[PDB]
Design a protein around this ligand. Sequence first.
Ligand SMILES: Nc1ncnc2c1ncn2[C@@H]1O[C@H](CSCC[C@H](N)C(=O)O)[C@@H](O)[C@H]1O
Ligand SMILES: Nc1ncnc2c1ncn2[C@@H]1O[C@H](CSCC[C@H](N)C(=O)O)[C@@H](O)[C@H]1O
Lengths: 262, 262, 63, 63
Amino acid sequence: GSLVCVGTGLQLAGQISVLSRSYIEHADIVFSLLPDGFSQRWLTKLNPNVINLQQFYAQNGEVKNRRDTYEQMVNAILDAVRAGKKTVCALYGHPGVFACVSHMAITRAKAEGFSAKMEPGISAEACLWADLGIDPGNSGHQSFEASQFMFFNHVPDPTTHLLLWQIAIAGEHTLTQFHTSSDRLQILVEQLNQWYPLDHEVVIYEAANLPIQAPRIERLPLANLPQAHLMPISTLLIPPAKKLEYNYAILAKLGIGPEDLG
Amino acid sequence: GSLVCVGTGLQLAGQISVLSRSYIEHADIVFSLLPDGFSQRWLTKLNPNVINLQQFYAQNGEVKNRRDTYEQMVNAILDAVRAGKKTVCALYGHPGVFACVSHMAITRAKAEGFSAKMEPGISAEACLWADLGIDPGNSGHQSFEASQFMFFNHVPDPTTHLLLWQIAIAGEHTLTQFHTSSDRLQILVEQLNQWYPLDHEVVIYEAANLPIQAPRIERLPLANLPQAHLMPISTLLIPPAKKLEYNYAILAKLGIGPEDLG
Amino acid sequence: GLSDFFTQLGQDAQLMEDYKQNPEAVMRAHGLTDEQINAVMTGDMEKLKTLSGDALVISHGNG
Amino acid sequence: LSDFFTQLGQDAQLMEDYKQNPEAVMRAHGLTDEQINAVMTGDMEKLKTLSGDSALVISHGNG
Ligand SMILES: Nc1ncnc2c1ncn2[C@@H]1O[C@H](CSCC[C@H](N)C(=O)O)[C@@H](O)[C@H]1O
Ligand SMILES: Nc1ncnc2c1ncn2[C@@H]1O[C@H](CSCC[C@H](N)C(=O)O)[C@@H](O)[C@H]1O
């Protein structure tokens, strides 16, 4: 048995890598976690032997810590591998971006002496740059999980493009809710007010999952975030607050200056 | 005429999206910028009408600003579009990740009232996460163009995974050289020494371009960077210098404590 | 019908470009109903799923 | 070489076969000993020389 974790991307059918598609096709069994049913149908046509990981999420207003959900997911995957099945894990976007299941599975599979690897996919971040036409290298890029950015000590560079993932559950500490409250978002706003003004234009982005669907690019002042309509698949883009200031200290050591910049 | 910029990923043939491949196939003309001649042959067999953008780079130890190169690249692409050709731009990895050609071509295309979009691809970043089994959401992620980090004021978060792109030309201010020098990289070390010890393990990462090629994952102390063998395709990974510490300030506002974390 | 169309559209750059030119024409040619087309034009994803039949968090920030 | 690498890169079946027994698969596709050696030694440069096909930089940071 072996494990290959692949990404399908965000778009239906067309945004998966050629090789990653081939893995699914020739897989003995596929553990899937896809955005919608259209994507689920597509997969089933590629490979009929599919197990939906979705089933491990809380069912019926049940109080369940996601850490247990993820653990149950990993176990299910490994069970297939241990049985001797050429197992493929198919997660939406990139299987290793803000996704622990794949990393955990591969880690555990290796520890048990099984072949396991991860194939890169197109993440929601990749889609963002293209849709908004922003180059992360232009002035640099930062990504944080929204709740981690509140619970732990993170200092952002206000000259870069900042991404706060899982903004929908920002400040949800129990890991048993699938959305947060406006009050939690207000605290985050207040925290961001250290580097970013209240009238600073932010962007709520949502990559399209369907080829006939247009992406969500909602621009609004940071202050209005708490009243905004957020969904699980919502990513918060916080553009630069300042421009790039020169670093004379280093330039001097380099023995150059602004006028010498090509 | 129309423009569609696509990524071919890093790996040969199999790391391109299903849709992006389709675009190349049905394109009237293709402008290419691929890593090697294996990828060049692959493209040629997919669509014979290919113009390689590689030609616009400095030829024969010539002194040429890359600003001009990219300009000539953009102009060559637009000429096709203005001609009326259904044009596709096939860049390696992700077309809009640390790449100004596409964004510049798309922007100019729209300005001239042409249809132009960008399809996301798999970038060297996406590969890194998969090869090193690192989740950017684990402790956070930051990306910076090496030289920009030296020339301008950037403050990294030592708790996050930090990527420095184009480390091979870090400090190359003329934009005429293809590589920097050890003395430049030495100054980078001193700069990084503000947040990272000299004995801090960094990783020189190079994603493979061939399916028989293993990736480059060289671990070494930050101090030995200046003596390290760097290539244009080399990315510098700087793991967290510090672990996540609770943000009591925000926790208090949330009216919770560390032990309340799910 | 609806599912097969979306699947093909998302994979075929030829059909995709055809769709861009004339969404309704392409959709009607693939036998999409008026209500299905309206949903697409108004971008009501919800309805699209209802007309077809029938969580995405895979991480946390608690360390 | 070029024909083999393109296939290998696209075909997951062939890929899994390769990782099972690299030399076996390479010999099966008619790669020379030197070519195989180059692969095992990880000498990409020689692979190119043997394929006859002897700037990835598309960005700056000077503002
Ligand atoms: N369609 C979409 N558009 C925008 N952001 C999305 C998205 N789907 C997921 N996300 C972001 O990703 C988070 C889930 S974590 C999983 C992300 C996925 N592996 C990827 O590669 O993108 C969401 O909370 C949101 O911040
Ligand atoms: N094969 C490879 N492995 C690792 N990093 C690479 C790489 N090819 C390019 N890079 C990185 O990308 C920089 C060039 S900018 C072009 C990046 C490309 N659009 C992408 O999607 O990755 C290099 O200086 C290096 O930092």
